[PDB]
Amino acid sequence: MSELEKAMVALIDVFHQYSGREGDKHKLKKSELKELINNELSHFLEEIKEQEVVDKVMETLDNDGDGECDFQEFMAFVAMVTTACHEFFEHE
């Protein structure tokens, strides 16, 4: 696989690692989301240590309002974090 292809597969892999932990094996509940952010985004996102931060991050990404993050919502999440990182570094 190319680097891009590997990146895509890694997105799908990290989602499933965290979503299959409890409940709907194909959705992130708040606790899986917090653990995904804490373990896998330590370098781009401030560690979450407060319930209200978990709550607000979910409220933000949850477009269909089932209180969980599904794959399509996770994709939007990756896009917002990636985009924020992209801009944070420009310009020079």
Add this chain to the structure above:
Amino acid sequence: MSELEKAMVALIDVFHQYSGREGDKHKLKKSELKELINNELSHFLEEIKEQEVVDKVMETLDNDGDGECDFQEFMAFVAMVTTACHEFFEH
């Protein structure tokens, strides 16, 4: 770097690799988009050999309409391709 953070940096890096070839250094034009898909998505998407295909792809992902693909547009393309890979290996 976690494999997620690795994947994020790869997205930013592959985009600039292609967008900085020609014209605006921060957007993909059709030729840059074509070569991106042909070289970097060779295992996920059919090779682009026809002008009507690159045209359609750019039209499809250019949500603003500047005839080019910026980083935001590119991120939605990666989401579309990632979703299709996800479904392919399920069911």
